[PDB]
Ligand binder design. Structure first.
Ligand SMILES: Nc1ncnc2c1ncn2[C@@H]1O[C@H](COP(=O)(O)OP(=O)(O)OP(=O)(O)O)[C@@H](O)[C@H]1O
Ligand SMILES: Nc1ncnc2c1ncn2[C@@H]1O[C@H](COP(=O)(O)OP(=O)(O)OP(=O)(O)O)[C@@H](O)[C@H]1O
Ligand SMILES: Nc1ncnc2c1ncn2[C@@H]1O[C@H](COP(=O)(O)OP(=O)(O)OP(=O)(O)O)[C@@H](O)[C@H]1O
Lengths: 514, 16, 534
């Protein structure tokens, strides 16, 4: 009754139960051993317990023994360790009586971390370790444990012959959550106390990383939002009693509650991808089209080449030319399963080692997919550089030079896009030879392009545009788009009479030639 | 590594 | 009924906690009030827990006791701190179960239609802490926590109990207990606002007005305006201090204590007592967030020339632009000029003139002996705090002193420079606006480092240049008489001068130490010898 773990079940069968089929005689002459320790870890869910019951079903095993939490702990002395030996009494009896031809024994531990990790705890751990593997050896006992914090388990329990199989279990997902939601909502649906405007699929999609107590918690909250409309407190505890004849639950009563009342415990998938594109992309010339076409050509090569699984590019241009946005646009249009952006904004005050670790982790994550794309921006800021001296960090430079020519595992593709605004420095440092190719991002050169950009922005009307064209059309200009937006915003502040003059005044100071 | 310093202790009384 | 017939919101004397009480009533008491038929139809379960927390002296105990008084039921049981621990083994659980035995018995005897029982736990963190993260001297605490968890929600179901717990450090509490079914509703009490500060002051003054013991000159609104960041306890303490000051004026102690008793029957409280107390007795426990603008502006500002007005107008224009823009959420500006020109005072004035909710100034005066990492951490903390508010303004002064610059070699700290260069281009979260004002005295050095391009605009702050401006400044300060002014003019008017205002003040103060027949001369020399400059 679980999907997405078919290969995991196949591995489980291969590891342990694949060797159980042969009669005892053939294994005896072989002397081959058998598995008796399995550990499962993964966030909370019904899958692990369902799996345990499934293993209980398939084999001709006794009624499995399951312990629910730290019930072993006791106030008296010697009782905490006393509960353990009772567990294996039947196993010892069967082993001593029927010998090899004895039934299998299955033990299920729930929240084993609670008991295994001071006189009570250490003695309990020692008793359990001795019973599982002591002077007497048992070949008909299986122990299964489930955890959500694997790092809190004792190391000794992981030594070979104590816990043999390691298993990772995924979380429950949308359709199961929908089944649980339907089961809970059935009561209100039956009595027509639920508004027809509510869509369960929408809420199931919206609620992500929530458990059952939280999933009940969201619904209960919604209910409250309804009842409070009938109450008439704040002066007394007397209520309407006439609106009590009817009561329903609207869609909003749910939505509000998931924003302002109930919060997920495991966080949420936060993304601010727009952060890198705050004003869209406006075609004011041919260079944008040329850059996009080159990006598409590079993308197709990575995806179809057999001899070159790794490809690198570099974006060049003067400051305030809009390179970080034109790289993100290409990355978005790539349409690859894995996309990530490495920026110095997230690393402030870090030392060289921290930066190296941060880059290494992102690349390690990238390697595990089939085809991936990664973009690094502000290289000069990443390896802090200052014209005086000059001074910089050599560790990060060497890490980058090593990473730029390391192929991923066999059969996988990777693309890397780097952005900078100081080409000469990189050329001097001998890094410009690592990249496979380069592209150039120019500024606005002629007045016609500036007029087209203004028209697309739509900030000035025809009357002012006429004067602007008269002044600028007969001359060359040198300005970046970001600076242009800043200047327009700055000039717009004053009264309508002075705006054109202020804008033209500023343009002359910011004017220049390459 | 400096070895952990010394510690105090707490006691519990029992009645027969 | 379950509610006392005479109960009403106004009688409990609570302050400005309207929203919190309404939320409690909604989420905790809605179910018990509706008729049994409909609630049974829904078949929903009832809340059983509440966890109040916040800074000290906000009203948690007052709120809990008022809730206890409001409800008509058995007298609430109170567990006064760690009174449940005992030396003998197994007796703590005895008390922790004796508390709930009566409720269990009543629920067994009457069933679903039984009354309600309320239990109040004070200083819960003392008893309940994480079982794993605890002292190993004794397992008594873990057994206590397990007993409480089992009793509150065990195999047997109990549904006629409400438990109230108050603390100050919610982090220490175990996670297993703060889950739905035990304590799901968790409030946070905080400092009040101006309206809350007015309501609180009203609640206490009532009787004095009733008996005509308060002078008419007292304005409660003004008092609420001044008292910023105060809490209810501090407000009551201020009232008590003013009362004591008023009362002290009818006793002649210090040899033997006596009371008038005939001139002491006409007592009244004036506004002077409140003003005196507000500066001597009560200081806010929470450090005042308002900057100490007096320290930075120690001698005011005097309009000795047009440039002052020009700079102020430019600052106002920048403030307006950052306030009324959406395409450019972040703006920056740099003030530059020769030393001893008064850049810091002008920047502080520009910051003050704006009415932004959040204003802070970062200076190296506090970072003495700090490493190159502590400075980065402090700047990061300041900017993180600034990010929260919708509108923010920040001032960074003495940049060259913040980078540890020395012209020999030269030397400086790279990490701080990189952090600043990154923070000058990081836009704040969506829908928020930030302004940054920087001050420096060496523009060429910043140009060399290639950070002058990171700012958006620059403003120049000049120093006195012409003799007329000097005469105007002297007139404004008024430190010399007409005869001396004529004598000084006869010389200065001929040529030009080059001096900063701060140095002018220092020179005047040094000159005024001589005898009257020499002071003027002492002044001129000091201007001539030091005045050699462009
Ligand atoms: N056609 C365009 N190409 C690029 N950017 C554009 C275009 N049209 C509008 N923009 C906007 O211009 C801004 C480009 O600024 P961006 O930060 O990408 O530039 P940059 O060259 O990396 O800057 P810097 O050198 O200051 O780091 C973004 O707001 C982008 O939305
Ligand atoms: N909101 C308020 N309205 C009226 N009086 C208040 C208010 N807050 C505090 N006070 C006054 O201050 C006293 C202190 O409040 P209280 O004892 O409830 O604080 P507390 O938060 O429980 O304390 P602590 O955290 O220090 O243990 C109250 O008894 C009352 O005198
Ligand atoms: N019109 C004025 N403008 C500026 N400051 C003034 C003016 N009139 C008086 N002052 C006072 O002059 C004093 C000098 O200002 P301040 O100490 O900020 O100068 P500064 O240029 O930042 O100094 P430094 O060169 O030492 O860094 C301040 O106390 C300020 O109050």
């Amino acid at each position: 009754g679980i999907g997405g773990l078919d290969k995991e079940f196949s591995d489980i069968f291969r590891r342990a139960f694949a060797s159980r089929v042969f009669p005892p005689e053939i294994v005896e002459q072989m002397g081959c051993k058998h598995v008796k320790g399995i550990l499962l870890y993964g966030p909370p869910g019904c899958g692990k317990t369902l799996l345990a019951r499934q293993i209980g079903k398939m084999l001709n095993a006794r009624e499995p023994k399951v312990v629910n939490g730290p019930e072993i702990l006791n106030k008296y002395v010697g009782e905490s360790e006393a509960n353990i030996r009772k567990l294996f009494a039947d196993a010892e009896e069967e082993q001593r009586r029927l010998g090899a031809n004895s039934g299998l024994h299955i033990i299920i531990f729930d929240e084993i971390d609670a008991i295994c990790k001071t006189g009570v705890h250490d003695t309990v751990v020692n008793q359990l370790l001795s019973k599982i593997d002591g002077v007497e050896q048992l070949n008909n006992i299986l122990v299964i444990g489930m955890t959500n914090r694997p790092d809190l388990i004792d190391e000794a329990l992981l030594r070979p012959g104590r816990l043999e199989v390691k298993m990772e279990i995924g979380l429950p997902d949308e359709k199961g959550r929908l089944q649980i939601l339907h089961i809970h909502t059935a009561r209100m649906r039956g009595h027509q106390l639920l508004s027809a405007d509510v869509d369960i699929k929408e809420l199931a999609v919206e609620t992500k990383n929530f458990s059952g107590a939280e999933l009940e918690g969201l619904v209960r909250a919604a209910q409250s939002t309804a009842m409070n409309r009938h109450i008439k407190a704040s002066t007394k505890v007397e209520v309407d009693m006439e609106k009590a004849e009817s009561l329903q639950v609207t869609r909003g009563d749910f939505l509000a509650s998931l924003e302002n009342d109930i919060k997920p415990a495991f966080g949420t998938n936060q993304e601010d991808y727009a952060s890198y594109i705050m004003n869209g992309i406006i075609k004011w010339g041919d260079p944008v089209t040329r850059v996009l076409d080159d990006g598409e050509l590079l993308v197709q090569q990575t995806k179809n080449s057999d001899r070159t699984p790794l490809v690198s590019v570099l974006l060049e241009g003067p400051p305030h030319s809009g390179k970080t946005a034109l790289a993100a646009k290409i990355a978005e249009e790539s349409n690859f399963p894995f996309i990530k952006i490495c920026s110095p904004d997230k690393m402030i005050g870090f030392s060289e080692t921290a930066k190296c670790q941060a880059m290494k982790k992102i690349f390690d994550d990238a390697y595990k997919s089939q085809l991936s794309c990664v973009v690094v921006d502000d290289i000069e800021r990443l390896l802090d550089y200052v014209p005086i001296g000059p001074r910089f960090s050599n560790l990060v430079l060497q890490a980058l030079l090593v990473l730029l020519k390391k192929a991923p595992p066999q059969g996988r593709k990777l693309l890397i896009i780097g952005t900078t605004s100081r080409k000469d420095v990189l050329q001097e440092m001998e890094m410009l030879n690592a990249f496979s190719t380069t592209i150039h991002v120019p500024n606005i050169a002629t007045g016609e392009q500036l007029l087209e950009a203004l028209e697309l922005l739509g900030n000035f009307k025809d009357k002012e545009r006429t004067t602007i064209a008269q002044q600028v059309k007969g001359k060359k200009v040198w300005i970046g788009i970001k600076k242009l937006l800043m200047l327009i915003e700055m000039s717009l502040q004053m009264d309508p009479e002075y705006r054109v003059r202020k804008f033209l005044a500023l343009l002359r100071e910011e004017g220049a030639s390459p | 590594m400096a070895e952990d310093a010394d510690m105090r202790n707490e006691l519990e009384e029992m009645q027969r």
